[PDB]
Amino acid sequence: MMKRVHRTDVKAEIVREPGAKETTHRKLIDTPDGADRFVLTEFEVSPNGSTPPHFHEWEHEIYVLEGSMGLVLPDQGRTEEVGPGEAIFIPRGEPHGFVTGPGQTCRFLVVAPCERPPVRNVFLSEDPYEYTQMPEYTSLLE
Amino acid sequence: MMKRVHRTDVKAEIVREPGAKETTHRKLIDTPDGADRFVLTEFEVSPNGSTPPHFHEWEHEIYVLEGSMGLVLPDQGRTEEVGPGEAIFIPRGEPHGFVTGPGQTCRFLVVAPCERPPVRNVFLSEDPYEYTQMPEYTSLLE
Numbered sequence: 438m439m440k441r442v443h444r445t446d447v448k449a450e451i452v453r454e455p456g457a458k459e460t461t462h463r464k465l466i467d468t469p470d471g472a473d474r475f476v477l478t479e480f481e482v483s484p485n486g487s488t489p490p491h492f493h494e495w496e497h498e499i500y501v502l503e504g505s506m507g508l509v510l511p512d513q514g515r516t517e518e519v520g521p522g523e524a525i526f527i528p529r530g531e532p533h534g535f536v537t538g539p540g541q542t543c544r545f546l547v548v549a550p551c552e553r554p555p556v557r558n559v560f561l562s563e564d565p566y567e568y569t570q571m572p573e574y575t576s577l578l579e
Numbered sequence: 580m581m582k583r584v585h586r587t588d589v590k591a592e593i594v595r596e597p598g599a600k601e602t603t604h605r606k607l608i609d610t611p612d613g614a615d616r617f618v619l620t621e622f623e624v625s626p627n628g629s630t631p632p633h634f635h636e637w638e639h640e641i642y643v644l645e646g647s648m649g650l651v652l653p654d655q656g657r658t659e660e661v662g663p664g665e666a667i668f669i670p671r672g673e674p675h676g677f678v679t680g681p682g683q684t685c686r687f688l689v690v691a692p693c694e695r696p697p698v699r700n701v702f703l704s705e706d707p708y709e710y711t712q713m714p715e716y717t718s719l720l721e
C-alpha cells in the first residue's frame with residue numbers, strides 16, 4: 438500500500454470543468470491509492486488557457502512547480518501573476534480562476550479534500566466559455 | 580484570507596524530531612493561515628542527513644521537488660532512491676525514514692492532516708541518534 442509514482446507515469450487527462458481551455462490534470466495520489474482525507478493532483482495550463490472563475494466550499498492549497506500564470510481574483514478586481522516556488526492558500530468560498538497568455542505554461546500542484554461539493558461559477562451562462570467574452574472578466578485580466 | 584507566499588519568504592527551521600540530522604522545514608501553509616484540515620510543508624535534507632525511521636497514525640503525501648534521497652522502508656528491508664517529480668503515498672502505520680549521503684540534497688513537499696498523533700520510532704533508544712549505529716538500520720541502507 439505505500440505508492441511511489443513518477444509524474445510522467447500518471448496520465449494527463451483534460452479537466453472536466455466546462456469552459457476550461459488548455460488545462461490538464463494528473464491525479465498523482467487519489468482515493469484508489471488509499472488516500473481517504475486529502476488528495477494530490479498536478480495541473481498544467483498550456484498557452485492561451487483558462488478556467489472559469491468559480492468558488493466552492495473546499496479550500497485549495499497550491500504549489501507552483503514550473504512556469505507562470507495568472508491567478509484571477511474576482512473579489513479583488515485583478516489577476517495576480519504567480520510563478521515557481523509560490524504557495525497559495527485559497528479559503529473556502531473565495532472566488533478564483535487561472536489564466537495563461539500566448540507564451541505561458543504553468544504546472545502546479547493542488548491539494549484537495551476528498552469531499553468536494555460542487556463548484557459555483559462567478560459568471561453564469563449557458564455557454565460555459567462565455568466568461569472569456571465578458572467585460573467584467575477581461576477587466577480582471579488587465 | 581487568500582495567502583500567497585514564495586518559499587524563500589518562509590523561514591527554514593531545524594526539525595524538532597530528536598535524532599534528525601541536517602533536516603529543515605518551511606511551513607508554507609499552516610493553521611494560522613486558515614488551513615483547518617491539511618497543511619503543506621517543504622522539507623529539505625542536506626548532505627549526510629537522516630531522520631529516525633518511524634511510523635504514525637497519519638498518512639503522508641509527498642512530492643519530491645529537487646535533488647534525491649533515500650526513502651528508508653524498514654518493513655521492506657531496503658531504501659528506495661527517490662528523485663524529482665516523484666509522488667509518494669505513505670499510509671498510516673507504514674514505517675519510513677529519510678537519508679542522504681555525502682553529496683545529496685533533497686527538497687520535497689509533505690501534505691499532512693492537521694491532527695497528528697505522536698510518532699513511534701522503529702528503533703527504540705535513549706540516545707535518539709543511536710539508530711545510525713544499529714546494524715538493523717545500516718542493513719536497510721545497502
Ligand code: NI
Nearest residue numbers: 491493497533
Ligand atoms: Ni477551485
Ligand code: NI
Nearest residue numbers: 633635639675
Ligand atoms: Ni513520517
